[PDB]
Design a protein around this ligand. Structure first.
Ligand SMILES: O=C(NCc1ccc(F)cc1)[C@@H]1c2ccccc2C(=O)N1Cc1cc2ncccc2[nH]1
Ligand SMILES: O=C(NCc1ccc(F)cc1)[C@@H]1c2ccccc2C(=O)N1Cc1cc2ncccc2[nH]1
Ligand SMILES: CSC[C@H]1O[C@@H](n2cnc3c(N)ncnc32)[C@H](O)[C@@H]1O
Ligand SMILES: CSC[C@H]1O[C@@H](n2cnc3c(N)ncnc32)[C@H](O)[C@@H]1O
Lengths: 625, 625
């Protein structure tokens, strides 16, 4: 169930070593390419002219074995950031040699340590290697939760351990990582191998690593406790961490000797498997969403575009949503028609944007459970969907449903409606121009008429995700602005990220709109209190909607409708990441803009530092009217 | 074994129709989306306001069934290129409607006819649809081998059939296709469904379709003969055509009613299967190459780049090549050392570019079968490969082989060689700078010394491939010249192409070179007699090499070494396709250019029309010294 590897720094026979590792259930082996102690000279004679082979032969394994089962390791003597110029130059040449041999073998990954603050020259050499030749090999930066200096024993008489709470100082290993990857310009080839220590740090120090590209989690054998049976186990503190890591789907590496000598080495792995099986199983959301983690998708535009059959199909596959619509209409019918007027009053319902007719069906179910009379119109502009409606209407519905093939903003209604029902909401509520459409359909609502939904609100929350930032970056395309990808929202199941502050309401719309000169343009300033250090990369967007009274739908995490999986979150990126210190406020500004042809969003960060205004005049992103 | 479909123009029940088609062994079904006779008005009242559903519901099949099993068809009444303005405008609206419904359903393909010369407005509407929304749906242009007017029966009294040999006129259906796809600007979404007739045309008319994107081959039931048993079969003429088509891996569509009424409809398909099984099986080349058909790859540069382990691995997997090297060295040893000097004379061999040591081994085998003494040097610049050599040398070879880790152009030899052996040849012979390397290694050859290979020649041949042209086109990348992809060669297993003329020698090199001021720059003019009409898209490159005397290696099709699969052909594209009439000569000019840092090729067509000079100053492509 869980993908696991073995870290060794001693391999006397490469073929024999693998066999043992494989027999114990491990999937891969982290090991050296050159002997860790085999220090090499490249400048000074005579040692530079050392004869013989420099390492093992590539022939000792199959190409496939190298490609899938071996993870390389930089030699421990290689120190590119040494103060001694000789050691620097030698380590440079050695690092390139080892990396080049890694590429030669076609290794899937290669481990490099981050065990100090200054890794500038290390970064400079790695970046040079990445921009030389072609390879898909990953680089896993071995970085500890807690620096070695900060988890040493307090056994030096004239050098006591820091017994002071240093909030920023305890987060120092993240800053080592942050600086390294910034120097390397967020290479997608560079990821984290997070080394877990005996004493876990404070919670903030761990939360630091949320939204970071963690590919591996190194577990020393030393951190394992022993149970009554006499086999390796972990603390409740470490258990919760592994449970969190299992959600990120990282690969667990075991390092160090067998301290549980009486038992096998598989026992360590068996415990991780034990934890893997013993977790809360995926709900309807997590089961279905499984696969779309941090996958960027363009926001749907049902007005501008005609949605395909299989786009409507997946919408209809959300029974929670339509049961809510059914219940909303059911309640509205009872409120509008009393018991004494049950069979005198026929309510005129109008589904505005009927699609393949999930609402029409719900409107029929609602009227039947309420026991009230209704007259349905099914307005739909998409002519491909109208084919479905009319086939259904002829076969099933009948003359009670009048299928209209038109734009709701154009349609000349032969009758005014008591209720209008619509499903024109996206991930950011008004991102499908629901305001504009329902404003133009407002005229054929009765003066006392109802709209379902009656209200909707969009929410924003600042996020830190070096993964998602790096994902957006990669959406650069030919023949357009080099930074257009940062000035447009994305529908994405947010997974590897950190929500820096609680969501706050951005834009609200009420239907029917009774404010003279109905203006759908908006400008909203939000101040987000941040209680951690972090790197803002964008803003997660959510929404809530009031269908009728107490019947609502929501994708806001704290009020999320349970089971519903129709709407994924939206993401508004920023061009450049922004540093945020603990105590500082992130201040974002959001505009909703429009002309006669388009609607779009602009946005800007104003605190703690200013960003550029994103998407001015909808240059990078517009929503078609 | 063979992928087959069924063409119907009558589907009374879509669910029932599929079942029957599936039961007969067909993989998919070509069928209408709207009723073929259901003509629709879009302008004039009252018929434009026709009520009811316009076609069947998308719900009648599953999303997956639409996506994999159904191929759409344009309605027969739709004529976008009609002379009547009303019919034009109506057919425009109808064509878009049908295409849009195709996309809605998510059909993998959609058939449109090319049954006349002028399909300009048809092309204009299709191109508009392709550049609207997003879809991966293919468009199969139904185009006959022989136009309907040219295979009609000679039964009109006052209108006799053309009994004149019209070379250009018999190729008219290709010109219909050519014009259509040119208007549509070689869209990768547009392909050919080639309709086979009762009477096949002349051979030239068929050869016309070589190098065209044929995705389907439509076979009417009418073209099938009947055997003694009373079951459908084809002529020997059609058999050879199907055998040719099976190499292209097209999908065979059966159209028309069952003329073999007494038998099942599966019999037609069973015959295609019968042919599929009864073909010449793939040789060592075609077996291994299977997968790389028309796949563009960058030419390897072993000098500039250090080749990976698995790149050397695949080279070593060609036993025919090294057996030839073994035999070449074997012969040279016998010529250089007489029988009386068997154990007095030790020949100094030097493998220049030893890799992981396939030649060294061959040199050992050669000396053993010859029974002569040798002293080996193994010069190799790639330090990753030198690791393999030294491990081998310590374990197996010993002190007889002296592994040198150096550039051959730099290495100061402690002894002059009797033989130098090299493997520095690419697909175009000198494309790996074998001349430059062996020139710089020439000094440590004895005055009477031998080089293996002693000579090599490159060959060129003009080709027509709308597939390969369209493939190169797609290699456009960000942040470089928009047409850089056309000014660089590609290693490609040429499959869907047409060789327009016989290969001719381009560049030749001899080693050792004894011409004063050894200049490796070249300029070659080639005139290729073309005996067909066609569209030149580039130049296939091959090579031959003389290892010693009569021992050779070759990838030139007519003298190809049997079994050898180390070198694929090279392709030099041109920016713009060039029309060539039958009888005209294609005149190409090739330069080999260099400075102190780089070597590159430039090329230009001068007849029948001029092209631009490709790759001036190696702007788009250089080979690193
Ligand atoms: O967020 C989304 N769905 C989440 C999802 C869940 C499971 C799965 F397998 C794939 C995707 C869709 C969507 C999908 C793909 C690409 C874009 C989008 C998008 O803007 N959505 C929001 C959305 C749903 C919807 N329903 C009706 C009317 C308007 C609507 N607007
Ligand atoms: O043409 C080529 N090989 C054909 C091939 C066959 C089977 C297969 F599965 C994949 C590829 C290689 C090649 C492969 C890939 C990408 C580029 C090339 C290329 O320039 N080649 C020519 C070549 C072979 C070679 N051997 C030794 C010294 C110099 C050499 N130069
Ligand atoms: C169920 S997703 C929203 C649906 O409403 C439809 N729709 C959106 N805008 C309009 C409009 N202005 N008039 C009619 N239908 C619309 C879309 O085509 C889609 O079927
Ligand atoms: C077998 S592919 C050609 C081999 O020759 C090697 N080679 C190419 N040019 C030189 C050179 N100038 N000196 C030494 N080896 C070379 C390459 O590194 C490769 O291993």
């Amino acid at each position: 169930r869980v993908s696991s590897g073995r870290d060794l720094n001693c391999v006397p026979e490469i073929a024999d070593t693998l066999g043992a590792v494989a027999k114990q259930g491990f999937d891969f082996l982290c090991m050296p390419v050159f002997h860790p102690r085999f220090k090499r000279e490249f400048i000074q004679e005579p040692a530079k002219n050392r004869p013989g082979p420099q390492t093992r032969s590539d022939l000792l394994l199959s190409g496939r074995d190298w490609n899938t089962l071996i993870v390389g390791k930089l030699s421990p003597w290689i120190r590119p950031d040494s103060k001694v110029e000789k050691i620097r130059r030698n380590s440079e040449a050695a690092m390139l040699q080892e990396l080049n041999f890694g590429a030669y073998l076609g290794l899937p990954a290669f481990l490099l340590p981050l065990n100090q603050e200054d890794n500038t020259n290390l970064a400079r050499v790695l970046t040079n290697h990445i921009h030389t030749g072609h390879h898909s090999s990953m680089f896993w930066m071995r970085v500890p939760l807690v620096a070695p200096e900060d988890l040493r024993d307090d056994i030096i008489e004239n050098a006591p351990t820091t017994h002071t709470e240093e909030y920023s100082g305890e987060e120092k290993t993240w800053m080592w990582w942050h600086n390294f990857r910034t120097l390397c310009d967020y290479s997608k080839r560079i990821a984290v191998a997070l080394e877990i220590g005996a004493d876990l740090p404070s919670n903030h120090v761990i939360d630091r690593w949320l939204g970071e590209p963690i590919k591996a989690a190194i577990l020393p054998t030393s951190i394992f406790l022993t149970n009554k049976k006499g086999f390796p186990v972990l603390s409740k503190m470490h258990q919760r961490l592994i449970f969190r890591l299992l959600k990120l789907e990282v690969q667990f590496i075991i390092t160090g000797t067998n301290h549980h000598s009486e038992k096998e080495f598989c026992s360590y792995l068996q415990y991780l498997e034990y934890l893997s099986q013993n977790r809360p199983p995926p709900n309807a959301y997590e089961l279905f969403a499984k696969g779309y983690e941090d996958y960027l998708q363009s926001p749907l535009q049902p007005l501008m575009d005609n949605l395909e059959s299989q786009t409507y199909e997946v919408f209809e596959k959300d029974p929670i949503k339509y049961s809510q619509y059914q219940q909303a209409i059911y309640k509205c019918l009872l409120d509008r028609v009393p018991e004494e007027e049950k069979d005198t009053n026929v309510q005129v319902l109008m589904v505005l944007g009927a699609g393949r007719g999930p609402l029409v069906n719900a409107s029929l179910r609602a009227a039947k459970q309420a026991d009230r009379r209704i007259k349905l119109y099914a307005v739909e502009k998409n002519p491909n969907a109208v084919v479905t409606l009319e086939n259904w209407q002829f076969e099933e519905w009948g003359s009670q449903v009048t299928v209209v093939s038109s734009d709701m903003r154009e349609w000349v209604a032969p009758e005014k409606a008591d209720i209008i029902v619509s499903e024109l909401l996206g991930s950011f509520a008004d991102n499908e121009l629901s305001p504009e459409c329902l404003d133009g359909a407002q005229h054929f609502l009765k003066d006392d008429g109802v709209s379902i939904p009656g209200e909707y609100t969009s929410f924003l929350a600042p996020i830190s995700s070096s993964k998602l930032y790096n994902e957006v970056r990669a959406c650069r395309e030919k023949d357009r602005d080099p930074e257009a990808q940062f000035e447009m929202p994305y529908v994405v199941r947010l997974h590897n990220f950190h929500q820096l502050s609680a969501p706050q309401p951005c834009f609200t719309f009420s239907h029917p709109n009774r404010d003279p000169m109905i203006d759908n343009n908006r400008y909203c300033t939000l101040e987000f209190p941040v209680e951690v250090n972090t790197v803002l990369h964008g803003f997660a967007g959510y929404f809530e909607t009031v269908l009728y009274q107490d019947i609502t739908l929501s994708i806001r995490p704290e009020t999320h409708s349970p089971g519903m999986f129709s709407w994924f979150p939206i993401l508004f990126p920023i061009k450049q990441p922004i540093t945020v210190r603990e105590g500082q406020t992130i201040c974002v500004r959001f505009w909703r803009c429009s002309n006669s042809k388009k609607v779009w969003y602009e946005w800007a960060v104003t605190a703690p530092v200013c960003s550029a205004i994103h998407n001015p005049t909808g240059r990078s992103y517009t929503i078609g009217l």
